Amino acid sequence: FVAGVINRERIPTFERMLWRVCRGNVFLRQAEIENPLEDPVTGDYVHKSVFIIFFQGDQLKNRVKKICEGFRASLYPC
Amino acid sequence: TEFWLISAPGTWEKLHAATTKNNNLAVSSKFNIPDLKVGTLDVLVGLSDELAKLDAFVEGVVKKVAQYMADVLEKVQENLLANGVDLVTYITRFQWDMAKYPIKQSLKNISEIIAKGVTQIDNDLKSRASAYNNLKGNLQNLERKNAGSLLTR
Amino acid sequence: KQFGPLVRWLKVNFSEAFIAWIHVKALRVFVESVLRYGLPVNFQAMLLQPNKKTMKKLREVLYELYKHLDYYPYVYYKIDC
Amino acid sequence: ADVQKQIKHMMAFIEQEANEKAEEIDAKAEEEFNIEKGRLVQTQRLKIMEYY
């Protein structure tokens, strides 16, 4: 399980790549956060979106963490 | 010549016959594959990287066998496969089911048996052909010692 | 003397190598089709045949059937010798 | 539409993972059973042969 944050501008190409290399699937939740927040140098004042990476498999965790750094997503433990 | 290899899952095997209606592209033979042992999702994803690694090594070692065939008598495509050409074999081949047991694990056991089996022929033929190339080069030096001026020959 | 032995050794090796590499691509087609396409019990496994200088139309013909079904939008493994 | 396909592909997978690990304990419940029984037989044989 992975929970994390990604900006709205990169979310449609993220799930296109997430469907591609994981390729079994991960049931992705799309939900946009409200009024813009700011991480200090990246990114400056942008409204982001949350996602949900359950997948239950514990092998595809390696195959999603490369994608989470490639699209520069910020993940937190839930 | 190339070789194209596409599966279309989803009767639906009669939609394969609908692709035979495209006769101006290809014939699109069947190439029946037997049911292999499954049961893992974590190991099946890991085997995908290992199958990608084993495919490039086995075809690349086979390409050197064609280059070593030119060292024998110097073109001709006589690579018969079970007393058959490569197009006729691949149109009607299957898993041998004894060379790679279907009862065994297809992810680890059947894959490594094909891996260690191919690497046994890869390492041995690389060393054996080096001995035949060593005698061929020295015989050219025997012809080189019988050449030139009489002070050197 | 060594030419007759090495040609028999190469014919023993290269015939076994191509049969194993065809079996290697079959396991590679056995994997990644169970994940791309669904697996109730098994996937519908069929294969195809090479083509000469018309593959630009073959890729257009295959993508039309596969875009409604679903690098390619289907499962594919090239095997050229 | 295609997301509902990939749901039942995964539910076929997670149910398959529960089945295969149940069979490997199903074999384990009988692989240990015929060898644990002969182990206690041999020690009870060694107890009954010394008192013999």
The resolution, in angstroms to one decimal, equals 3.8
* Residue B28 CA neighbour count, 13 Å, CB half: 21
DSSP string for B70-98: HHHH-------SSSS-HHHHHHS----SS
CA distance C32 to B107: 12
Q: What is the DSSP letter of A9?
A: G
CA distance C17 to B120: 11
Closest-CA residue of C relative to A19 is C36
- Which residues of C1-81 form beta strands (DSSP E)? 75-76
Tokens standing for A44?
């400056």
Cα-Cα end-to-end distance for chain C: 30
Could you tell me how many CB contacts below 8 A there are between chain C and chain D? 10
Question: Residue A58: left if φ>0, alpha if ψ -120 to 50, beta else—which one?
Answer: left
DSSP collapsed to 3 states, A2-63: CEEEEEHHHHHHHHHHHHHHCCCCCCCCCEECCCCECCCCCCCCECEEEEECCCCCCCCHHH
Closest-CA residue of B relative to D14 is B41
Tokens standing for B27?
């014939």
Backbone phi, psi, residue C40, to 5°: -65, -60
Residue type present at position D25: I
CA distance B28 to C51: 10
**Method by which this entry was solved:** cryo-EM
Cβ under 8 Å to B: C residues 46-65: 46-52, 54-55, 57-58, 61-62, 65
Closest-CA residue of C relative to B130 is C6
Tokens standing for B32?
């029946």
Tokens standing for B119?
């690497």
Neighbors of chain D by Cβ distance (3+ pairs < 8 Å): A, B, C
Q: What is the DSSP letter of A71?
A: T
- Given the structure tokens 């495209």, which residue do they identify? B22
Q: In terms of DSSP bridges, do strands A74-76 and A3-7 run parallel, antiparallel, or are they unpaired?
A: antiparallel
CB B89 within 8 A of CB C17: no
Query: B149 to each of A16, B54, B145, how far by Cα in Å?
Result: 74, 54, 10
CA distance C37 to B135: 55
CB A25 within 8 A of CB D6: yes
CA–chain centroid gap for D19, Å, is 12
Q: In this complex, is the C-beta atom of D7 within 8 Å of any C-beta atom belonging to chain C?
A: no
Contacts of C38 in chain D (CB under 8 A): 5-6, 8-9, 12
Question: CA torsion, points C66, B89, C39, B101, in degrees to nearest 10?
Answer: -160
- Given the structure tokens 């939740």, which residue do they identify? A29
Closest-CA residue of A relative to B46 is A59
Neighbors of chain C by Cβ distance (3+ pairs < 8 Å): A, B, D
Query: Under DSSP, is residue C75 helix (H, G, I), strand (E, B) or coil?
Result: strand
Among A37, B96, A50, D8, residue whose Cα is nearest residue C37: D8
- Given the structure tokens 């993220």, which residue do they identify? A14
Nearest residue, CB atoms, B13 vs list C34, C44, C52: C44
What interhelical angle do D33-50 and D2-31 show, nearest 10? Answer: 10
Contacts of C51 in chain B (CB under 8 A): 2, 4, 25-26
Q: In this complex, is the C-beta atom of D6 within 8 Å of any C-beta atom belonging to chain C?
A: yes
Can the peptide bond before residue A43 be classed as cis, meaning omega within 30 degrees of 0? yes
